[PDB]
Amino acid sequence: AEIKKQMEAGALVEIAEGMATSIAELQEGFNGSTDNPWNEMGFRIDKQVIEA
């Protein structure tokens, strides 16, 4: 609730932004760089049963 109040106030504003090429270009320790991995996605699979 308090965060939303600050949002209404315009104090806090929704944002998103991309990565610089200067970073992305050498991501995952490329060219001697380090500590800069990619983010990754996968999935999980599960199951459920029903007594008849």
The contact set with a second copy (CB under 8 A) reads: 4, 7-8, 10, 13-21, 24, 27, 38-43, 45, 50-52
Rounded least distance, CB 35 to a second copy, Å: 17
Q: Which is nearer to a second copy, 7 or 29 (CB)?
A: 7
3-state class (DSSP) for residue 30: helix
CA distance linking residue 7 with residue 14, whole number of Å = 8
Nearer residue to a second copy within complex by CB, 32 or 42:
42
Question: Which position has the token pair 């944002």?
Answer: 15
